[PDB]
CSV table of C-alpha atoms and ligand atoms in Angstrom, one decimal:
chain,number,residue,atom,x,y,z
A,1,UNK,CA,-19.0,-33.7,-65.3
A,2,UNK,CA,-16.4,-33.7,-68.1
A,3,UNK,CA,-14.8,-30.5,-66.9
A,4,UNK,CA,-14.8,-29.1,-63.3
A,5,UNK,CA,-18.4,-28.0,-63.8
A,6,UNK,CA,-19.5,-30.2,-60.9
A,7,UNK,CA,-16.3,-29.9,-59.0
A,8,UNK,CA,-17.2,-28.2,-55.7
A,9,UNK,CA,-15.4,-27.1,-52.6
A,10,UNK,CA,-16.6,-24.9,-49.8
A,11,UNK,CA,-15.9,-24.1,-46.1
A,12,UNK,CA,-17.6,-22.0,-43.5
A,13,UNK,CA,-17.2,-21.2,-39.8
A,14,UNK,CA,-18.9,-19.1,-37.2
A,15,UNK,CA,-17.6,-19.0,-33.6
A,16,UNK,CA,-18.9,-16.8,-30.8
A,17,UNK,CA,-17.8,-16.7,-27.1
A,18,UNK,CA,-19.2,-14.2,-24.5
A,19,UNK,CA,-18.3,-14.0,-20.8
A,20,UNK,CA,-19.3,-11.9,-17.9
A,21,UNK,CA,-18.6,-11.7,-14.1
A,22,UNK,CA,-18.8,-9.6,-11.0
A,23,UNK,CA,-17.7,-9.7,-7.4
A,24,UNK,CA,-18.3,-7.6,-4.3
A,25,UNK,CA,-17.0,-8.4,-0.8
A,26,UNK,CA,-16.5,-6.4,2.4
A,27,UNK,CA,-15.4,-7.1,6.0
A,28,UNK,CA,-15.4,-5.2,9.3
A,29,UNK,CA,-13.9,-6.5,12.5
A,30,UNK,CA,-14.2,-3.7,15.1
A,31,UNK,CA,-15.9,-3.0,18.4
A,32,UNK,CA,-17.5,0.4,19.1
A,33,UNK,CA,-19.5,1.6,22.1
A,34,UNK,CA,-22.6,3.6,21.1
A,35,UNK,CA,-25.2,5.7,22.9
A,36,UNK,CA,-29.0,5.5,22.6
A,37,UNK,CA,-30.5,8.3,20.6
A,38,UNK,CA,-34.2,7.7,21.3
A,39,UNK,CA,-36.6,5.1,22.3
A,40,UNK,CA,-39.1,4.0,19.7
A,41,UNK,CA,-42.8,3.1,20.2
A,42,UNK,CA,-42.1,-0.7,20.2
A,43,UNK,CA,-39.1,-0.3,22.5
A,44,UNK,CA,-36.4,-0.4,19.9
A,45,UNK,CA,-33.5,1.8,20.6
A,46,UNK,CA,-31.9,4.2,18.1
A,47,UNK,CA,-28.2,4.0,18.8
A,48,UNK,CA,-25.5,6.4,17.4
A,49,UNK,CA,-21.9,6.3,18.3
A,50,UNK,CA,-18.6,7.8,17.2
A,51,UNK,CA,-14.9,7.3,18.0
A,52,UNK,CA,-11.9,9.4,16.9
A,53,UNK,CA,-8.3,8.1,17.0
A,54,UNK,CA,-5.3,10.2,16.2
A,55,UNK,CA,-2.4,7.7,15.9
A,56,UNK,CA,-0.1,10.3,14.2
A,57,UNK,CA,-0.3,12.6,11.2
A,58,UNK,CA,-4.0,12.3,10.7
B,1,UNK,CA,-20.0,-17.5,-56.1
B,2,UNK,CA,-17.8,-17.6,-59.2
B,3,UNK,CA,-15.5,-14.9,-57.9
B,4,UNK,CA,-14.9,-14.1,-54.2
B,5,UNK,CA,-18.2,-12.3,-54.2
B,6,UNK,CA,-19.5,-14.5,-51.4
B,7,UNK,CA,-16.0,-15.1,-49.8
B,8,UNK,CA,-16.3,-13.7,-46.3
B,9,UNK,CA,-14.0,-13.3,-43.3
B,10,UNK,CA,-14.5,-11.2,-40.2
B,11,UNK,CA,-13.3,-11.1,-36.6
B,12,UNK,CA,-14.3,-9.0,-33.5
B,13,UNK,CA,-13.4,-8.8,-29.9
B,14,UNK,CA,-14.4,-6.7,-26.9
B,15,UNK,CA,-12.7,-7.3,-23.5
B,16,UNK,CA,-13.3,-5.3,-20.3
B,17,UNK,CA,-11.9,-5.8,-16.8
B,18,UNK,CA,-12.5,-3.5,-13.8
B,19,UNK,CA,-11.3,-3.9,-10.3
B,20,UNK,CA,-11.5,-2.0,-7.0
B,21,UNK,CA,-10.4,-2.4,-3.4
B,22,UNK,CA,-9.9,-0.6,-0.1
B,23,UNK,CA,-8.5,-1.4,3.4
B,24,UNK,CA,-8.3,0.3,6.7
B,25,UNK,CA,-6.9,-1.0,9.9
B,26,UNK,CA,-5.8,0.4,13.2
B,27,UNK,CA,-4.5,-0.9,16.5
B,28,UNK,CA,-3.8,0.5,20.0
B,29,UNK,CA,-2.2,-1.4,22.9
B,30,UNK,CA,-1.7,1.1,25.7
B,31,UNK,CA,-2.9,1.7,29.3
B,32,UNK,CA,-3.8,5.2,30.5
B,33,UNK,CA,-5.2,6.3,33.8
B,34,UNK,CA,-7.9,8.9,33.4
B,35,UNK,CA,-9.9,11.2,35.7
B,36,UNK,CA,-13.6,11.8,35.9
B,37,UNK,CA,-14.8,15.0,34.4
B,38,UNK,CA,-18.4,15.0,35.4
B,39,UNK,CA,-21.3,12.7,36.5
B,40,UNK,CA,-24.2,12.4,34.0
B,41,UNK,CA,-27.8,12.1,35.0
B,42,UNK,CA,-27.9,8.3,34.4
B,43,UNK,CA,-24.7,7.8,36.5
B,44,UNK,CA,-22.3,7.6,33.5
B,45,UNK,CA,-18.9,9.2,34.1
B,46,UNK,CA,-17.2,11.5,31.6
B,47,UNK,CA,-13.5,10.6,31.8
B,48,UNK,CA,-10.7,12.7,30.5
B,49,UNK,CA,-7.0,11.8,30.9
B,50,UNK,CA,-3.6,12.8,29.5
B,51,UNK,CA,0.0,11.6,29.8
B,52,UNK,CA,3.1,13.2,28.6
B,53,UNK,CA,6.4,11.4,28.1
B,54,UNK,CA,9.8,13.0,27.2
B,55,UNK,CA,12.1,10.1,26.3
B,56,UNK,CA,14.6,12.4,24.6
B,57,UNK,CA,14.6,15.0,21.9
B,58,UNK,CA,10.8,15.5,21.8
C,1,TLW,O1,-20.5,-27.5,-75.8
C,1,TLW,C1,-20.2,-26.4,-75.4
C,1,TLW,O2,-21.2,-25.5,-75.2
C,1,TLW,C2,-18.8,-26.0,-75.0
C,1,TLW,C3,-17.8,-27.0,-74.5
C,1,TLW,C4,-16.7,-26.2,-73.7
C,1,TLW,O3,-15.6,-25.9,-74.5
C,1,TLW,C5,-17.3,-25.0,-73.1
C,1,TLW,O4,-16.4,-24.3,-72.3
C,1,TLW,C6,-17.8,-24.0,-74.2
C,1,TLW,C7,-16.7,-23.1,-74.6
C,1,TLW,O5,-16.8,-21.9,-74.0
C,1,TLW,C8,-16.8,-22.8,-76.1
C,1,TLW,O6,-15.9,-21.8,-76.5
C,1,TLW,O7,-18.2,-24.8,-75.3
C,2,TLW,O1,-21.4,-9.9,-65.6
C,2,TLW,C1,-20.9,-8.9,-65.1
C,2,TLW,O2,-21.6,-7.9,-64.8
C,2,TLW,C2,-19.4,-8.8,-64.8
C,2,TLW,C3,-18.5,-10.0,-64.6
C,2,TLW,C4,-17.2,-9.6,-63.8
C,2,TLW,O3,-16.2,-9.4,-64.7
C,2,TLW,C5,-17.5,-8.3,-63.1
C,2,TLW,O4,-16.4,-8.0,-62.3
C,2,TLW,C6,-18.0,-7.2,-64.0
C,2,TLW,C7,-16.7,-6.4,-64.5
C,2,TLW,O5,-16.6,-5.3,-63.7
C,2,TLW,C8,-16.9,-6.0,-65.9
C,2,TLW,O6,-15.9,-5.1,-66.3
C,2,TLW,O7,-18.6,-7.7,-65.2
């Protein structure tokens, strides 16, 4: 060890960060009167309805 | 490792952000007297009505 033959110095680093996300929301707060389309074998009713409103410009 | 042969340094990044939205609202707070148009087989009434108001300039 007379010289710096044994003198040693070293550093090392490794950092990793990963992220991920997702969202999906929906809301509906109306009331619509529909009409029966047909009666199924079990008695369930197929209902279809439509409502058109022309407030102004569309 | 005498020289910088092993000396290493690196960085990397990847960021992504996506968004989306939509809204649709409507309101109606009137009163209109309508007239029956015809009587359906089940007794339902087809009602049609119209009201015209000329406040001024239109
Ligand atoms: O004993 C040896 O072998 C050495 C001692 C140091 O001086 C070393 O560095 C080398 C030099 O390169 C000679 O020129 O010689
Ligand atoms: O032992 C070798 O092969 C080396 C030592 C370094 O000096 C290196 O860089 C290369 C240089 O390119 C020679 O000119 O030679």
